From Swiss-Prot, chain C:
Record note on modification: Ubiquitinated, leading to its degradation. Deubiquitinated by USP16, promoting its stability.
Domain of life according to the entry: Eukaryota
Gene: Tekt2
Subunit composition and interactions: Microtubule inner protein component of sperm flagellar doublet microtubules. May interact with CCDC172.
Part of the full-length chain shown: 378 to 417 of 430
Bridged cysteine pairs (disulfide): none
Listed name of the protein: Tektin-2
Tissues where this protein is expressed: Expressed in the testes (at protein level).
Function: Microtubule inner protein (MIP) part of the dynein-decorated doublet microtubules (DMTs) in cilia and flagellar axoneme. Plays a key role in the assembly or attachment of the inner dynein arm to microtubules in sperm flagella and tracheal cilia. Forms filamentous polymers in the walls of ciliary and flagellar microtubules.
Compartments, record wording: Cytoplasm, Cytoskeleton, Cilium axoneme; Cytoplasm, Cytoskeleton, Flagellum axoneme; Cytoplasm, Cytoskeleton, Microtubule organizing center
Homology family: Belongs to the tektin family.
Curated annotation (Swiss-Prot), chain D:
Top-level taxonomic group: Eukaryota
Annotated localization: Cytoplasm, Cytoskeleton, Cilium axoneme; Cytoplasm, Cytoskeleton, Flagellum axoneme; Cytoplasmic vesicle, Secretory vesicle, Acrosome outer membrane
PTM remark: N- and O-glycosylated. Ubiquitinated, leading to its degradation. Deubiquitinated by USP16, promoting its stability.
Disruption of the gene: reported phenotype: Sperm with reduced motility (47%) and forward progression and increased flagellar structural bending defects. However, normal fertility is maintained.
Family label: Belongs to the tektin family.
Subunit comment: Microtubule inner protein component of sperm flagellar doublet microtubules. Interacts with TEKT1, TEKT2, TEKT4 and TEKT5. Interacts with CCDC38.
Protein name, as recorded: Tektin-3
Main function: Microtubule inner protein (MIP) part of the dynein-decorated doublet microtubules (DMTs) in cilia and flagellar axoneme. Forms filamentous polymers in the walls of ciliary and flagellar microtubules. Required for normal sperm mobility.
Tissue: Expressed preferentially in testis. Expressed predominantly in late pachytene spermatocytes and early round spermatids. Expressed in spermatozoa.
Residue span relative to the full protein: 393 to 441 of 490
Organism classification: Eukaryota, Metazoa, Chordata, Craniata, Vertebrata
UniProtKB/Swiss-Prot annotation, chain H:
Keyword Nucleus set for record: yes
Listed name of the protein: Protein SPMIP9
A biological-process GO annotation: flagellated sperm motility
Tissues/organs with expression: Only detected after the mouse is 35 days old. Expression increases gradually from day 35 to 6 months, and remains stable after 54 days. Exclusively expressed in the epididymis and testis.
Phenotype when the gene is knocked out: Deficeint mice are fertile and have no detectable defects in the testis/body weight ratio, epididymal sperm count, and testicular and epididymal histology.
From Swiss-Prot, chain I:
Entry PTM: Ubiquitinated, leading to its degradation. Deubiquitinated by USP16, promoting its stability.
Subcellular localization, as worded in the UniProt entry: Cytoplasm, Cytoskeleton, Cilium axoneme; Cytoplasm, Cytoskeleton, Flagellum axoneme
Similarity-based family: Belongs to the tektin family.
Gene it is expressed from: Tekt1
Description of how the protein assembles with itself and partners: Microtubule inner protein component of sperm flagellar doublet microtubules.
UniProt-recorded name of the protein: Tektin-1
Protein purpose: Microtubule inner protein (MIP) part of the dynein-decorated doublet microtubules (DMTs) in cilia and flagellar axoneme. Forms filamentous polymers in the walls of ciliary and flagellar microtubules.
Entire protein: shown range: 158 to 209 of 418
Disulphide-bonded residues: none
């Protein structure tokens, strides 16, 4: 049972790790930063959970 | 950059000679298969071998 | 100012909750955090 | 407009449980909308000029 | 690139569109122009310019 | 029928599949709406289970 | 780099191309299949004429 | 040690009450609707049999040749509209987004929040600043800047 | 026009270096985040190349 609980916690930690990395890169973006381009459609695409 | 348009002769010949244009089993105007004996009768429908 | 008042008060209550866990009030035994757990 | 669309694209990559509709997501969508309206107003004034 | 030539005294067309490739040699800043051979076009094709 | 029915000799030749464009069909016989056959409006009462 | 453009084709070569000597097969909902699988099925509709 | 189909005569074994594959049944059936409910369409493109004069509607040059199926391919608050002080883009967004203020058209600077602090008690509203009143409009209506006690210690 | 061209070239080199920097930072973050009690922890692989 302890193994099952730890497995759930490990998945949660890995997912939050990836999400935090993406959110940091989004927060620190700037107006003429590298790799900024048009992405028409993303303002209408909505596939949240 | 200035190009003259194509004539009706050329346009019809290109449509006839297109790689993608296809023909079918010579259906009726209503949309039914035309009988093989009808096509054998050398009349309003012919044979395509 | 009213939101600060709670956070100052609440930090006191969290701080006073360290009167427990004193090495003479409890006996925590040693803990093997650095391990490769075997329940896999 | 470019940087807003880039932020939205990157935040589409969040993992399954983290794929959340957050207030920042709403704000970015609204920001893209407003930038488009601003561009339209400027083009209108250009034509009038 | 393509370049267009007017053709007189023909039954069918009054213009051509010949297809050609321009190579730029960096070593010496030179250029060359070569026409790839089309199957049944009656033009003598090959290297347009040395 | 086909729009080319104008030069169809109805006084000699019978109506055939080479001259009809559409056929009376179960899409037209649907309960609750009238349908005209030979100038008879024939309102559909009801149908079978 | 400037945005690319599509190159025009040579109408003479398009005219000289050879055709598509092929054909497309029909559906198989023949009268035989319709008879063999929809026999003994009729639809009865009550109606009135005014 | 004995068998029971013995006591069955040939009359029954001949005469009994009347009682392909399902995929064949499902496939064959979609092929009946594909005939029974089929309707023809104009197919708006000049074909070979109509002849040369029909081949004048789509304009093309030698540039367009080569495309598959050879023919040219065929064919909310806006800020352009004038708006007054209480009407703006943010007012258009003032309800869908996580703030839920809705305008009352009788008194334009009186918005209603959807999330009221106490629906059991009578409703409450928010007041937009500026604005203008005519003919004294006597409605004494709740406005609320925050939720809490009437006389706060920290003000 | 020529000065503009030179600025474009310098900007291009700077962007390239920025991309490699970001990738290296991401890899180092993943490496720093590892722990003994972690999934995907695995042994080595045997391969000999000598490549400069």
């Amino acid at each position: 049972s302890d193994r099952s609980a730890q497995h759930e916690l490990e998945k949660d930690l890995s997912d939050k790790q990836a999400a935090l990395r993406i959110d940091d890169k989004c927060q620190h973006l700037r107006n003429t930063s590298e790799g900024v381009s048009y992405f028409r459609g993303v303002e209408r695409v909505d596939a949240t959970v | 950059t200035d190009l003259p348009p194509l004539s009706e002769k050329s346009k019809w010949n290109l449509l006839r000679l297109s790689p993608d244009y296809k023909r079918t089993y010579q259906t009726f105007p209503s949309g039914k298969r035309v009988s093989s004996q009808e096509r054998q009768r050398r009349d309003l429908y012919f044979e395509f071998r | 100012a009213c939101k600060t008042n709670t956070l100052l008060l609440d930090t006191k209550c969290m701080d006073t909750r360290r009167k427990l866990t004193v090495p003479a009030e409890k006996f925590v035994p040693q803990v093997d955090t650095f391990t490769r757990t075997t329940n896999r | 407009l470019k940087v807003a669309q880039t932020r939205l694209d990157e935040r589409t990559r969040r993992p399954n449980v983290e794929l959340c509709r957050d207030m920042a997501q709403l704000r970015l969508v609204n920001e893209v909308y407003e930038v488009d309206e601003t561009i339209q107003t400027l083009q209108q004034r250009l034509r009038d000029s | 690139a393509y370049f267009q030539e007017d053709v007189p005294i023909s039954m069918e067309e009054h213009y051509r569109i010949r297809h050609v490739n321009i190579y730029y040699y960096l070593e010496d800043d030179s250029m060359s122009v070569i026409e790839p051979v089309v199957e049944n076009s009656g033009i003598p094709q090959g290297k347009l310019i040395k | 029928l086909v729009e080319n029915a104008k030069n169809f000799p109805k006084c000699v030749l019978e109506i055939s599949d080479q001259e009809v464009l559409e056929w009376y069909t179960a899409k037209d016989f649907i309960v609750g709406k009238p349908l005209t056959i030979l100038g008879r409006t024939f309102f559909i009462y009801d149908c079978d289970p | 780099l400037n945005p690319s453009e599509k190159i025009p084709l040579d109408p003479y070569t398009q005219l000289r191309k050879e055709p598509v000597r092929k054909y497309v097969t029909p559906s198989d909902f023949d009268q035989l299949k319709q008879f063999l699988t929809f026999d003994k099925q009729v639809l009865r509709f009550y109606a009135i004429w005014d | 040690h004995v068998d029971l189909d013995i006591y069955q005569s040939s009359y029954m074994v001949d005469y009994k009450p009347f009682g392909v594959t399902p995929q064949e049944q499902a496939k064959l059936d979609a092929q009946l609707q594909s005939k029974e409910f089929y309707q023809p369409k104009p197919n708006p493109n000049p074909k070979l049999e109509e002849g040369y004069p029909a081949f004048r509607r789509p304009y093309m040059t030698a540039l367009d040749l080569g495309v598959p199926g050879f023919f040219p391919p065929q064919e909310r608050f806006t800020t352009t509209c004038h708006y007054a002080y209480p009407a703006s883009l943010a007012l258009y967004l003032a309800q869908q987004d996580p703030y839920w203020l809705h305008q009352r058209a009788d008194f334009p600077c009186l918005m209603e929040p959807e999330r009221q602090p106490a629906p059991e008690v009578g409703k409450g509203y928010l007041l937009l600043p500026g604005c203008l009143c005519d003919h004294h409009q006597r409605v004494k209506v709740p406005i609320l800047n925050r939720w809490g006690p009437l006389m706060p210690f920290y003000q | 026009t020529e000065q503009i061209r030179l600025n474009r070239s310098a900007k291009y080199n700077l962007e390239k270096d920025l991309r490699d920097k970001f990738t290296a930072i991401t890899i180092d973050d993943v490496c720093f985040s590892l722990n003994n009690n972690s999934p995907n922890i695995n042994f080595s692989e045997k391969v000999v190349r000598i490549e400069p």
